[PDB]
Amino acid sequence: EVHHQKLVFFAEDVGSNKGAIIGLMVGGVVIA
Amino acid sequence: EVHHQKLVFFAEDVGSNKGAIIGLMVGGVVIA
Amino acid sequence: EVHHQKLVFFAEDVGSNKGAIIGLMVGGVVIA
Amino acid sequence: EVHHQKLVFFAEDVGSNKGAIIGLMVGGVVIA
Amino acid sequence: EVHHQKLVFFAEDVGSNKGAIIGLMVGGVVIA
Amino acid sequence: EVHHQKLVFFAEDVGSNKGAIIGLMVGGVVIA
Amino acid sequence: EVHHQKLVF
Amino acid sequence: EVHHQKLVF
Amino acid sequence: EVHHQKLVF
Amino acid sequence: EVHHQKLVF
Amino acid sequence: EVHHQKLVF
Amino acid sequence: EVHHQKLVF
């Protein structure tokens, strides 16, 4: 038996990437 | 037996990428 | 037996990419 | 004045997605 | 004045995603 | 004045994601 | 087993 | 087993 | 077993 | 200005 | 200015 | 200015 109960409540841009500059590389090759 | 109950509530651009510059590379080759 | 109950509620552009510049590459070759 | 000279040479399935399972989501909504 | 000279040489599946399981999410909403 | 000269040489699956399990999330919302 | 929820604003 | 929740603003 | 919660603002 | 390259295998 | 390169295997 | 390189195996 497992219960659960949530009341999550976020107000402003929680966890957002607003205006960010994001560069990812997971593997691959770049010969610049 | 498993229960669950959520009341998620997001107000503004939570988790958004508004105005972001995003560059991803998962594998591949780029000979620049 | 498994229950569930959600009341998700998003107000503004949650999770949006409004005005973003997004470049993805999953494999492939680019000889620039 | 700008010069350039390349002799790119790939042998096997460079940058390929052979047999991969790829799932992308750039925006959108999925109510599963 | 700018020169350049490359002799890139890849032999096997360099930068490949052979047999990989790849899941991306750039924005969007998933109510599972 | 700027010169350059490369002799890149990769032999095996350099920078590859062969058989990897990759999960990315750049923004977005997942209500699991 | 009885359960419910509301939301008002 | 009885359970619930509310939200008002 | 009875449980609940509220939120007001 | 003179330049070149080769490849043999 | 003169430049070059080779590759053999 | 002169420059070069090689590779053999």
XYZ file of C-alpha atoms in Angstrom:
246
model
C 0.000 0.000 0.000
C 1.364 3.391 -1.081
C -0.376 6.768 -0.827
C 0.581 10.193 -2.163
C -0.670 13.784 -2.123
C 0.859 16.897 -3.699
C -0.138 20.548 -3.936
C 2.725 21.936 -6.008
C 2.387 25.675 -6.650
C 4.846 27.718 -8.734
C 4.305 31.447 -9.222
C 6.886 33.014 -11.519
C 9.196 31.583 -14.170
C 10.433 28.763 -11.964
C 12.975 26.543 -13.674
C 12.931 28.672 -16.814
C 15.769 29.462 -19.217
C 14.496 32.926 -20.123
C 17.144 34.801 -22.063
C 19.804 32.168 -21.436
C 22.487 31.103 -23.900
C 22.819 27.329 -23.744
C 25.263 25.156 -25.647
C 25.319 21.387 -25.192
C 27.462 18.670 -26.702
C 26.866 15.004 -25.868
C 29.346 13.181 -28.046
C 30.080 14.108 -31.620
C 33.040 15.784 -33.277
C 33.592 19.452 -34.134
C 36.658 20.309 -36.235
C 36.571 24.095 -36.029
C -2.663 -0.813 -4.042
C -1.333 2.600 -5.092
C -3.106 5.958 -4.810
C -2.183 9.403 -6.116
C -3.470 12.981 -6.044
C -1.974 16.122 -7.593
C -3.006 19.765 -7.797
C -0.158 21.200 -9.857
C -0.534 24.941 -10.466
C 1.904 27.027 -12.533
C 1.327 30.754 -12.988
C 3.891 32.367 -15.272
C 6.215 30.982 -17.935
C 7.480 28.155 -15.754
C 10.045 25.975 -17.484
C 9.979 28.133 -20.605
C 12.808 28.971 -23.001
C 11.500 32.430 -23.877
C 14.129 34.349 -25.800
C 16.816 31.737 -25.195
C 19.509 30.720 -27.670
C 19.878 26.948 -27.546
C 22.343 24.817 -29.469
C 22.437 21.045 -29.047
C 24.607 18.362 -30.580
C 24.048 14.684 -29.779
C 26.546 12.904 -31.973
C 27.270 13.870 -35.539
C 30.213 15.590 -37.181
C 30.728 19.271 -38.007
C 33.786 20.177 -40.099
C 33.661 23.961 -39.860
C -5.281 -1.550 -8.012
C -3.983 1.880 -9.046
C -5.786 5.222 -8.742
C -4.896 8.681 -10.033
C -6.214 12.248 -9.939
C -4.748 15.409 -11.474
C -5.814 19.045 -11.658
C -2.982 20.515 -13.715
C -3.392 24.256 -14.304
C -0.977 26.375 -16.364
C -1.589 30.098 -16.798
C 0.957 31.746 -19.079
C 3.289 30.396 -21.753
C 4.583 27.570 -19.589
C 7.162 25.421 -21.336
C 7.072 27.594 -24.446
C 9.889 28.470 -26.843
C 8.548 31.922 -27.698
C 11.156 33.874 -29.615
C 13.868 31.283 -29.030
C 16.565 30.303 -31.514
C 16.969 26.534 -31.412
C 19.448 24.434 -33.351
C 19.576 20.662 -32.948
C 21.767 18.007 -34.499
C 21.242 14.319 -33.716
C 23.751 12.573 -35.924
C 24.460 13.564 -39.487
C 27.384 15.319 -41.126
C 27.866 19.009 -41.932
C 30.911 19.952 -44.025
C 30.753 23.733 -43.767
C 41.363 37.696 -49.127
C 40.348 34.285 -47.763
C 41.551 30.872 -48.950
C 40.425 27.359 -48.044
C 41.302 23.737 -48.806
C 39.735 20.535 -47.466
C 40.280 16.829 -48.062
C 37.615 15.345 -45.801
C 37.585 11.538 -45.882
C 35.116 9.375 -43.934
C 35.292 5.587 -44.162
C 32.525 3.871 -42.215
C 29.132 5.034 -40.974
C 30.473 8.242 -39.473
C 27.795 10.346 -37.823
C 25.117 7.758 -38.551
C 22.072 6.810 -36.481
C 22.047 3.166 -37.559
C 19.637 1.206 -35.407
C 19.073 4.087 -33.000
C 15.785 4.946 -31.309
C 15.356 8.712 -31.382
C 12.531 10.732 -29.878
C 12.469 14.520 -30.124
C 10.041 17.117 -28.851
C 10.550 20.815 -29.591
C 7.500 22.451 -28.093
C 4.020 21.037 -28.350
C 1.753 19.339 -25.841
C 1.235 15.630 -25.150
C -1.586 14.679 -22.765
C -0.889 10.973 -22.352
C 44.404 37.800 -45.272
C 43.358 34.406 -43.893
C 44.532 30.975 -45.059
C 43.373 27.478 -44.138
C 44.220 23.844 -44.878
C 42.622 20.664 -43.525
C 43.135 16.951 -44.100
C 40.452 15.501 -41.836
C 40.388 11.693 -41.899
C 37.896 9.563 -39.943
C 38.040 5.773 -40.151
C 35.254 4.092 -38.201
C 31.869 5.291 -36.972
C 33.236 8.496 -35.485
C 30.573 10.632 -33.852
C 27.873 8.063 -34.570
C 24.817 7.154 -32.502
C 24.762 3.504 -33.561
C 22.329 1.577 -31.404
C 21.786 4.476 -29.013
C 18.503 5.372 -27.333
C 18.107 9.142 -27.426
C 15.298 11.195 -25.939
C 15.270 14.982 -26.205
C 12.863 17.607 -24.950
C 13.407 21.297 -25.708
C 10.368 22.968 -24.224
C 6.876 21.582 -24.480
C 4.589 19.917 -21.968
C 4.037 16.217 -21.258
C 1.203 15.304 -18.874
C 1.867 11.594 -18.440
C 47.453 37.780 -41.560
C 46.373 34.408 -40.151
C 47.512 30.956 -41.288
C 46.319 27.478 -40.335
C 47.129 23.830 -41.044
C 45.499 20.677 -39.664
C 45.975 16.954 -40.205
C 43.279 15.551 -37.929
C 43.177 11.745 -37.958
C 40.663 9.657 -35.984
C 40.769 5.864 -36.159
C 37.966 4.228 -34.196
C 34.592 5.471 -32.978
C 35.992 8.675 -31.518
C 33.351 10.852 -29.904
C 30.625 8.305 -30.601
C 27.560 7.443 -28.526
C 27.469 3.786 -29.552
C 25.017 1.902 -27.378
C 24.502 4.826 -25.014
C 21.229 5.771 -23.342
C 20.870 9.543 -23.468
C 18.081 11.637 -21.998
C 18.091 15.421 -22.297
C 15.710 18.081 -21.067
C 16.290 21.759 -21.856
C 13.269 23.473 -20.389
C 9.763 22.120 -20.632
C 7.460 20.500 -18.106
C 6.871 16.812 -17.364
C 4.028 15.948 -14.973
C 4.654 12.236 -14.505
C -12.511 5.304 -0.467
C -13.645 8.822 -1.394
C -11.455 11.615 -2.738
C -11.808 14.952 -4.525
C -10.285 18.395 -5.046
C -11.266 21.917 -6.060
C -9.747 25.108 -7.469
C -11.190 28.638 -7.336
C -9.706 32.045 -8.129
C -9.846 6.144 3.453
C -10.948 9.668 2.505
C -8.730 12.434 1.151
C -9.050 15.764 -0.654
C -7.495 19.190 -1.191
C -8.444 22.716 -2.226
C -6.893 25.886 -3.648
C -8.305 29.430 -3.537
C -6.790 32.818 -4.345
C -7.114 7.094 7.433
C -8.180 10.621 6.453
C -5.934 13.352 5.076
C -6.221 16.669 3.241
C -4.632 20.076 2.675
C -5.546 23.602 1.609
C -3.963 26.743 0.159
C -5.340 30.301 0.240
C -3.790 33.667 -0.598
C 51.463 31.351 -52.855
C 51.313 27.649 -53.751
C 49.663 24.903 -51.715
C 48.440 21.331 -52.150
C 47.842 17.999 -50.419
C 47.564 14.295 -51.196
C 46.103 11.088 -49.764
C 47.053 7.496 -50.636
C 46.206 4.159 -49.029
C 54.455 31.346 -48.948
C 54.274 27.641 -49.824
C 52.595 24.921 -47.778
C 51.342 21.357 -48.195
C 50.712 18.040 -46.449
C 50.402 14.335 -47.207
C 48.909 11.148 -45.761
C 49.829 7.543 -46.613
C 48.950 4.223 -44.988
C 57.438 31.193 -45.178
C 57.221 27.483 -46.021
C 55.515 24.798 -43.951
C 54.226 21.243 -44.338
C 53.562 17.948 -42.563
C 53.216 14.239 -43.288
C 51.692 11.080 -41.815
C 52.575 7.459 -42.636
C 51.663 4.162 -40.982
